[PDB]
UniProtKB/Swiss-Prot annotation, chain A:
Disease: Spermatogenic failure 18: An infertility disorder caused by spermatogenesis defects and characterized by abnormally shaped spermatozoa in the semen of affected individuals. SPGF18 patients present with primary infertility and multiple morphological abnormalities of sperm flagella that result in impaired sperm mobility. Abnormalities include absent, short, coiled, bent, and irregular flagella. SPGF18 inheritance is autosomal recessive. Ciliary dyskinesia, primary, 37: A form of primary ciliary dyskinesia, a disorder characterized by abnormalities of motile cilia. Respiratory infections leading to chronic inflammation and bronchiectasis are recurrent, due to defects in the respiratory cilia. Some patients exhibit randomization of left-right body asymmetry and situs inversus. Primary ciliary dyskinesia associated with situs inversus is referred to as Kartagener syndrome. CILD37 inheritance is autosomal recessive.
Domain of life the protein comes from: Eukaryota
Cellular localisation: Cytoplasm, Cytoskeleton, Cilium axoneme; Cell projection, Cilium, Flagellum
Organ and tissue specificity: Expressed primarily in trachea and testis, 2 tissues containing axonemal structures. Also expressed in brain.
Subunit structure: Consists of at least two heavy chains and a number of intermediate and light chains.
Protein name as annotated: Dynein axonemal heavy chain 1
Organism the protein comes from: Homo sapiens (Human)
UniProtKB/Swiss-Prot annotation, chain B:
Its biological purpose: Force generating protein of respiratory cilia. Produces force towards the minus ends of microtubules. Dynein has ATPase activity; the force-producing power stroke is thought to occur on release of ADP.
Native source organism of the sequence: Homo sapiens (Human)
Tissue occurrence: Expressed in several tissues, including brain, pituitary, testis and trachea, with highest levels in testis.
Compartment(s): Cytoplasm, Cytoskeleton, Cilium axoneme
Assembly notes: The dynein complex consists of at least two heavy chains and a number of intermediate and light chains.
Family: Belongs to the dynein heavy chain family.
Residues of the full protein shown: 55 to 97 of 4158
Domain remark text: Dynein heavy chains probably consist of an N-terminal stem (which binds cargo and interacts with other dynein components), and the head or motor domain. The motor contains six tandemly-linked AAA domains in the head, which form a ring. A stalk-like structure (formed by two of the coiled coil domains) protrudes between AAA 4 and AAA 5 and terminates in a microtubule-binding site. A seventh domain may also contribute to this ring; it is not clear whether the N-terminus or the C-terminus forms this extra domain.
Superkingdom assignment: Eukaryota
Protein name as annotated: Dynein axonemal heavy chain 6
UniProtKB/Swiss-Prot annotation, chain C:
Location of the protein in the cell: Cytoplasm, Cytoskeleton, Flagellum axoneme
Entry's disease: Spermatogenic failure 84: An autosomal recessive male infertility disorder characterized by multiple morphologic abnormalities of the sperm flagella, resulting in severely reduced motility. Some patients also have a reduced sperm count.
Oligomer status and interactors: Component of axonemal radial spokes, the protein complexes that link the outer microtubule doublets with the central pair of microtubules. Interacts with CFAP91/MAATS1, ODAD2/ARMC4, RSPH3A, ROPN1, ROPN1L and RSPH9. Interacts with DYNLT1, DYNC1I2 and TUBB3. Interacts with WDR35, IFT22 and IFT81.
Gene Ontology cellular-component terms listed: axoneme; motile cilium; sperm flagellum
BP-aspect Gene Ontology terms: cilium movement; cilium organization; sperm flagellum assembly
Protein name as catalogued: Cilia- and flagella-associated protein 61
Pfam families, sorted: CFAP61_dimer (PF23150), CFAP61_N (PF16092)
Organism encoding this protein: Homo sapiens (Human)
UniProtKB/Swiss-Prot annotation, chain D:
Lineage: Eukaryota, Metazoa, Chordata, Craniata, Vertebrata
Disease connection: Spermatogenic failure 51: An autosomal recessive infertility disorder characterized by asthenoteratozoospermia. Spermatozoa exhibit multiple morphologic abnormalities, including absent, short, bent, coiled and irregular-caliber flagella. Abnormalities of the sperm head, base, and acrosome have also been observed.
Family that this chain belongs to: Belongs to the CFAP91 family.
Shown residues in whole-protein numbering: 513 to 601 of 767
Protein name (database record): Cilia- and flagella-associated protein 91
Origin species: Homo sapiens (Human)
Protein role: Involved in sperm flagellum axonemal organization and function. May regulate cilium motility through its role in the assembly of the axonemal radial spokes.
Assembly mode: Interacts with MYCBP and AKAP1. Part of a complex containing MYCBP, AKAP1 and PRKAR2B. Interacts with CFAP61.
Post-translational modification summary for this protein: Phosphorylated by PKA.
Location of this chain's protein in the cell: Mitochondrion; Cytoplasm; Cytoplasm, Cytoskeleton, Cilium axoneme
Length: 299, 43, 1092, 89
């Protein structure tokens, strides 16, 4: 019998309508117990002689506990920098999902997928992709070659393609720009960066280097050779120099571009992902680039 | 088998109940594509 | 349902549970010498008895490995109970420590393999238990360290010197944010949809099948000025959804519910009609309220449902009130426990209850203190419309002048102030009748009286609280105890002196104790004290203590309607109410004019109807369901099962969630045969007139006494018309009620010549006065009184062919002497049947009727929401026990077992209900409560009869049965010294019969049922000796069962088990070592009974 | 249709023992003998088992109230002799 916990809820004391229920006059001549007397009108204190305080700020100075969710490991990554591209109108038909749900849903199913598991799902290791020096002491030509007995020789950028980027880098930077503001902020993303950034910078194709996908901050894009500026961020994601502001507008000064510090590197689209692009289109572009580069070293 | 008297009892039996929120049905019926069409008559 | 891991990696599944009585042994086992150093030398029983909160953590095996103890005053002697706040502010003013949000730790025991996890889970449990609590505080000696367990949860503030020793004490605080922090509350975004969907689907999918899968998204998307969607989230993921709307219907609200206390949640206006020039007030002001439509939260964070409220009131700045309407069956959750229950009007047909809160209730700056002279205008402003406000002001003035009741008793008064406005007033005194309270009430069920001093009991004169701040009533009671040193508070309710309170929702009723009628004239200086043998005015006792000020109640808002105020219904509602941890809101009894005991009838008048000795007027004044059960006055005339309501004779309707029918059986007006006697026919050939109902106008001189109001009407009408002088009376019946009415008329002054008694036996083998001795005594005393006897007389006519209103004459047909006699008075007690109005009500509602209401074993009718009990019921034929009905058993036990069945429906602590198996489908449950029949017979003979529940069989046949056993008869029934005891074959009492000229303690003599060896050992003088007084003690059965379990444990029950050599059994009894243990239990009984 | 619908269940409460006996020649006779046998051996077995258990409980309570009458005589006689030596001193 019976039922429990419909879900709290309420009916409606709808101000406009009185007619749906009819006359409410069919109950008894009731003699209550004296606690249901004790919550009556005059045998409670009446509201007609009540007093009220005057300030709303007194509650916010009385409180002593802050917000756990609003006091977390704060960062400076723009929330619009996480928004993927979408061919959906503002006003969907009723019964269909709207665009804010669609953007969120592609956000969680982008961040739920890892790119390294994608790599060894395809059967590809990025450290072996990134070209190495020749070790003529230990002869490369042997009877055990997985496919090229000679290592990767011309770089991945020289063999890649670009038009499968859903935005061109100009509106990538425009998406990085805040609306109604000249200020621009670093775009989160992951780059195939050498773990040893030092030996990466004095010898990018060393055999002792190892090349993993690690998170970076996209900063600028140069057009004449078409590269993206990246720099490693820490756990707070705040990007400083010796005097401490977040790197905004690349630190571009009117006297000239900033001198290069040790960490910020120029990387290609073969090497970089955005946080607002699909790891699945990333997968298809990188496997088609690997297939075409295999075809061209075959020729 | 069912009877017409039984269907009269079924029309009498059920309780009367209304919306989740009146304004909730108002904006849903206000953003219906049909209401978009009477909005087209309003323009 | 938590998981703890040892540092060695062993995993245990743990849970927090309430403290039991056997837990003290495990706590003393867990007590260490380091624990003794850290918390002094503690009496664990005393500490847990006085404790505000004792929390125990156990495993799947229910092994006790953790416990903590919490009170509202400091652990060591560094600050006073009243004035710890000032000392703690001087220690650290930056801590916002108040008695509202600070609690103190006094004892913590844990297994060292899981001590840190046990501590953190206990702290989380207490922070969930009391959501307002923010600081947990520990005092230790400053020359000792905390240890690795408490050092991970406690942070040091500094040192406080001892008030009685020259030692500083290190002080440590644990904060609520470290274990159960406040949920952040923000405006809902449409991105919270995936976060909130499984939370909704853990409760209900009717939303999905009604409004689709994107309904929550649309609802959040369309936020506007009038409607706001709000969420609470943890770590950026939403764990609670919230929806508020500014549009409310004050017209429906004032039509359906009583909102006098809040002006109908509208702004005050000059055009408001607040008084009658019930009266329904008229409010013209603008609405200052909004409504909640949707609320859901995760069960992990249900204790912090109050955090939404500051944000939603910041959104609705122009409104002052927030409402919910929830139907009668939703259990009370944590957010609604803060809200205030509203009262629907008596005409309300709505299926939903209403709860209302006001914006000022969020103010945590409420201050309780001792009352001063300056708070008198505030007290006047708050009580100036309240009833006995003059009495409350007089008590306040007495406290402000001399702090004493004029008899010399200490008086105290406490005030609650919010934003420099007094909002609560309480007046208490020291309690002086603690001995009477203990001896006459079940206060041992709530407190250990030996651990409580005399000054710790406060009698509770006056309570008044702001209905806005009603949710702090529990805090008010705790603070009253803390400031005024009380550990117990007692509230007295007197039958209509009257009083004023609003804490009685949070106060618990105390069951009165049955009292031994002591023969004080022969006990003398062995007699108990005046507080034990006192007979003052009868009142209901109500209790609270410090543990109860943190213990919550399980609330039932379901409309439980019981039809008929019989003994079964009285017992049922009594057992419903006297459950301590229940809180019933909609218990309503429909009766003719109310529950029995409406009129304070005298003893010389109460002999109109015989007594079943289940309830009486002093019991009613003790139990006081006018303090706990709503009462409908009026006769019911219809039932609608599908719409779930009952139609009364006033054309007014009570809706029900559960219906119970306990009208019993009532005396019907006998329809005259109207058969001609001029042919002098035999009464065999004329058709029987048992079935026919009198459909004409009931005469004004025809009376059927079925209740106290009918008896009072008969007494009133006799006194107005002066019938003791000239009128003649015919009483037509053969029940005990007939003889008691004749004796009552003799007492009132009716002469024996004018009264005429008629008893026709039509048929059946029912046993009326089955004992031959008292039957002959009744016949002999009746003949000696000389009242005109007529037997086997069927009522032929009233008035001999004319209208019988009023009766001037009547006719009776008899096989021996048919007579036409001048009938001026006609009392009717011939037969009891279901009333015609109720019977057509249930017939048109299609409830099952085969000569009675056909019920199952679990008292179900054919409708699962309707149940019936009392003499109106007959079991189903599937049991093949058509001779067995509830009329064969005791009514009070029937009502008690009805309530025992019904608490399983609504009590989570008890087991949930189950369907009957084949065993219970095929038999009916038997009952051992003895049937009692008492009254005063003609000749001023007090007559009592206690019988085993059985099918009526003649006593001659019963004694002719070979298993009848023994029979002890003393005195003479004609001399009025008759006493009778039937001893069965197993040497137990099965029948007691008493017929005495002098009044005797029948309430004592009830207990004489089943007394074996005492029987084997003038019978009034035989029960004079105090062996039966010890039998007649009330706490005897309680210790019976515990020493039964003791002796069943190794044994004596086994010695019996190969008994199936009686001196052999007695000798092995004397050999076995239970004698010392039973003498230890003798000393325990003596400890329990040096008092009472 | 409505006549059957309104009071359908009282028919089954009387059908505890079915009354027709035309097609239920085959089955309802077996059902009558089984249900009378059920009442019989339920009454036999359960009543003597419960009677034996009640005898055990009653004998244990008999010993209880025997030493309890001893307790009552002891208590009242102690009060008497305590006041006796009280006024003796």
């Amino acid at each position: 019998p019976l039922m429990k916990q419909r879900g709290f809820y309420s009916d409606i004391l709808s101000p406009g309508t009185l007619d749906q229920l009819g006359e409410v006059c069919r109950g008894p001549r009731m003699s209550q117990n004296l606690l249901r007397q004790a919550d009556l009108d005059k045998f409670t204190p009446r509201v007609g002689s009540f007093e009220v305080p005057e300030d709303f700020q007194e509650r916010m100075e009385q409180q002593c506990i802050g917000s756990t969710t609003r006091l977390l490991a704060q960062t400076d990554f723009p929330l619009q920098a996480y928004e993927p591209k979408m061919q959906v109108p503002f006003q969907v038909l009723p019964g269909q999902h709207p665009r804010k749900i669609e953007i969120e849903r592609r956000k969680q199913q982008y961040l739920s997928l890892d790119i390294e598991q994608l790599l060894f799902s395809q059967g590809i290791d990025s450290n072996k992709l990134m070209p190495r020096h020749l070790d003529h002491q230990h002869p490369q030509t042997i009877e055990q070659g997985h496919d090229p007995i000679f290592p990767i020789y011309l770089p991945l950028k020289v063999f890649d393609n670009e038009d499968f980027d859903c935005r061109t880098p100009r509106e990538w930077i425009n998406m990085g720009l805040e609306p109604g503001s000249l200020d621009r902020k670093p775009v989160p993303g992951k780059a195939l960066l050498p773990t040893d950034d030092f030996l990466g910078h004095e010898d990018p194709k060393s055999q002792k280097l190892k090349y993993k996908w690690c998170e970076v901050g996209v900063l600028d894009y140069d057009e004449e050779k078409k590269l993206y500026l990246v720099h490693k961020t820490d756990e707070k994601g705040l990007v400083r120099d010796e005097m401490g502001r977040p790197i905004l507008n690349a630190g571009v000064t009117t006297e000239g571009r900033p001198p290069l510090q040790v960490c910020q590197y120029w990387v290609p689209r073969i090497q970089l992902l955005f946080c607002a692009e699909d790891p699945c289109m990333f997968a298809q572009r990188v496997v088609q680039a690997n297939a075409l580069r295999k075809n061209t070293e075959a020729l | 088998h069912i009877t017409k008297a039984q269907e009269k009892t079924r029309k009498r039996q059920q309780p009367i109940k209304l919306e989740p929120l009146p304004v909730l049905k108002v904006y849903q019926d206000h953003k219906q594509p049909e209401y978009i069409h009477e909005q087209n008559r309003f323009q | 349902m938590s998981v703890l891991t040892s540092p060695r990696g062993k995993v245990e599944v743990v849970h927090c549970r309430r403290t039991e009585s056997q837990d003290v042994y495990c706590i003393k086992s867990l007590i260490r010498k380091f624990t003794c150093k850290l918390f002094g030398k503690l009496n664990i029983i005393y500490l847990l008895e006085k404790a505000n909160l004792a929390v125990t953590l156990c495993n799947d095996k229910e092994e006790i490995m953790a416990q903590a103890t919490f009170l509202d005053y400091p652990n060591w002697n560094v600050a006073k109970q009243d004035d710890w706040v000032s000392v703690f502010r001087e220690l650290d003013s930056d801590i916002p420590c108040t008695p509202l949000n600070t609690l103190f730790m006094h004892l913590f025991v844990a297994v060292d393999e899981y001590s840190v996890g046990c501590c953190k889970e206990i702290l989380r449990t207490v922070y969930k238990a009391v959501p307002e609590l923010h600081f947990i505080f520990l005092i230790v000696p400053s020359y000792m360290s905390l240890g690795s367990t408490l050092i991970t949860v406690f942070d040091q503030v500094g040192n406080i010197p001892c008030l009685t020793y020259e030692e500083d004490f290190a002080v440590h605080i644990c904060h609520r944010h470290s274990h159960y922090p406040q949920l952040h509350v923000r405006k809902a975004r449409v991105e919270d949809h995936d976060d909130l969907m499984p939370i909704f689907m853990r409760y209900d999918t009717i939303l999905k099948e009604t409004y689709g899968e994107y309904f929550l998204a649309e609802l959040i998307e369309a936020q506007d000025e009038e409607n706001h969607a709000v969420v609470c989230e943890v770590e950026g993921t939403a764990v609670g959804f919230m929806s508020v709307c500014s549009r409310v219907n004050m017209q429906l609200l004032h039509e359906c519910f009583d909102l006098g206390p809040f002006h109908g949640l509208c702004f005050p206006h000059p055009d408001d009609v607040l008084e009658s020039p019930h009266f329904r007030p008229i409010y013209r002001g603008a609405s200052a309220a909004f409504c909640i439509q949707l609320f859901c939260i995760d069960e992990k964070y249900e204790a912090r449902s109050l955090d939404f409220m500051n944000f939603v009131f910041s959104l609705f700045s122009d409104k002052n009130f927030c409402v919910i309407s929830l139907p009668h069956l939703t259990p009370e959750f944590f957010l609604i426990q803060n809200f205030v229950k509203m009262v629907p009007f008596n005409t309300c047909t709505l299926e939903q209850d209403l709860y209302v809160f006001h914006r000022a209730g969020l103010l945590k700056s409420i201050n309780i203190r001792f009352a001063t002279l300056l708070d008198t205008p505030g007290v006047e402003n708050l009580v100036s419309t309240l009833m006995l406000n003059k009495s409350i002001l007089e008590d306040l003035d007495r406290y402000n002048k001399a702090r004493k009741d004029p008899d010399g008793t200490l008086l105290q008064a406490f005030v609650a102030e919010v934003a420099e406005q007094i909002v609560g007033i309480a007046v208490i005194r020291n309690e002086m009748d603690i001995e009477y309270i203990r001896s006459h009430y079940n206060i041992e069920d709530f407190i250990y009286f030996s651990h409580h001093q005399r000054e710790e009991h406060g009698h509770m004169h006056h309570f008044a609280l702001n209905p806005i701040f009603r949710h702090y009533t529990k805090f008010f009671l705790k603070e009253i105890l803390r400031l005024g040193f009380k550990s117990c508070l007692y509230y007295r309710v007197y039958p209509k002196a009257h009083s004023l309170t609003s804490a009685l929702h949070y106060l618990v009723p105390v069951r009165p104790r049955r009292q031994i009628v002591y023969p004080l004239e022969k006990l003398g200086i062995n007699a108990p004290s005046k507080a034990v043998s006192k007979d003052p005015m009868s009142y209901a006792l109500n209790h609270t203590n410090r543990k109860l000020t943190l213990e919550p109640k399980i609330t039932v808002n379901a409309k439980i309607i019981v039809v008929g105020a019989s003994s079964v219904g009285i017992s049922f509602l009594e057992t419903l109410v006297f459950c301590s941890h229940m809180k019933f809101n909609n218990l309503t009894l429909i009766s003719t004019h109310g529950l029995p005991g409406k009129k304070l009838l005298d003893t010389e008048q109460r002999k109109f109807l015989a007594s079943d000795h289940c309830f009486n007027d002093k019991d009613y004044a003790l139990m006081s369901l006018c303090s706990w059960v709503n009462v409908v006055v009026g006769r019911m005339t219809g039932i609608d099962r599908a719409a779930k309501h009952v139609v009364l004779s006033t054309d007014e309707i009570v809706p029900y969630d559960h219906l119970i029918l306990c009208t019993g059986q009532q005396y019907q007006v006998p329809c005259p045969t109207e058969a001609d006697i001029s042919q002098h026919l035999t009464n065999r050939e004329v058709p029987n007139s048992s079935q026919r109902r009198y459909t004409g106008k009931v005469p004004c001189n025809h009376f059927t006494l079925n209740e106290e109001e009918d008896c009072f009407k008969a007494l009133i009408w006799i006194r107005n018309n002066s019938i003791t002088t000239e009128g003649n009376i015919i009483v037509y019946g053969n029940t005990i009620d007939t003889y008691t009415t004749v004796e009552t008329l003799l007492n009132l002054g009716v002469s024996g010549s004018r009264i005429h008694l008629v008893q026709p036996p039509p048929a059946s083998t029912i046993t009326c006065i089955n004992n031959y001795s008292v039957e002959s005594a009744v016949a002999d005393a009746l003949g000696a009184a000389g009242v005109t006897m007529y037997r086997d007389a069927i009522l032929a006519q009233w008035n001999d062919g004319l209208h019988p209103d009023p009766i001037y004459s009547a006719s009776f047909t008899t096989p021996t002497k048919p007579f036409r006699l001048q009938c001026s008075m006609f009392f009717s007690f011939c037969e009891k049947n279901v009333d015609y109005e109720t019977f057509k009500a249930l017939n048109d509602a299609c409830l099952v009727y085969d000569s009675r209401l056909v019920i199952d074993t679990n008292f179900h009718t054919n409708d699962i929401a309707i149940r019936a009990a009392g003499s109106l019921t007959k079991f189903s034929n599937r049991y093949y026990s058509n001779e067995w009905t509830h009329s064969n058993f005791s009514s009070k036990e029937i009502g008690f077992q009805l309530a025992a069945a019904m608490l399983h429906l609504f009590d989570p602590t008890l087991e949930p209900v189950t369907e009957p198996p084949a065993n219970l489908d095929r038999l009916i449950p038997m009952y051992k409560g003895a049937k009692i029949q008492g009254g005063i017979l003609p000749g001023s003979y007090h007559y009592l009869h206690i019988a085993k529940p059985a099918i009526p069989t003649p006593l001659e046949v019963q004694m002719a049965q070979p298993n009848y056993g023994l029979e002890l008869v003393t005195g003479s029934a004609k001399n009025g010294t008759y006493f009778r005891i039937h001893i069965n074959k197993y040497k137990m009492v099965e029948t007691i019969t008493c017929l005495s000229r002098e009044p005797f303690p029948a309430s004592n003599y009830i207990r004489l049922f089943g007394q074996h060896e005492q029987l084997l050992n003038d019978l009034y003088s035989y029960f004079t000796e105090p062996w039966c007084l010890a039998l007649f003690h009330d706490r005897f059965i309680d210790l019976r069962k515990e020493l039964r379990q003791i002796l069943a444990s190794k044994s004596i029950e086994q010695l019996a088990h190969q008994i199936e050599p009686r001196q052999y059994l007695k000798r092995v009894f004397e050999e076995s070592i239970y004698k010392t243990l039973v003498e230890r239990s003798t000393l325990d009984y003596l400890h329990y009974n040096r008092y009472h | 249709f409505e006549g059957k619908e309104k009071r359908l269940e009282l028919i089954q409460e009387l059908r505890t023992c079915h009354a027709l006996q035309e097609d239920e020649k085959l089955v309802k006779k077996a059902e009558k003998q089984v249900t009378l046998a059920l009442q019989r051996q339920r009454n036999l077995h359960e009543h003597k088992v419960s009677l034996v258990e009640n005898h055990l409980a009653g004998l244990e309570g008999r010993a209880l109230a025997d030493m309890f009458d001893f307790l009552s005589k002891e208590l009242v006689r102690l009060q008497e002799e305590r006041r006796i030596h009280a006024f003796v001193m």
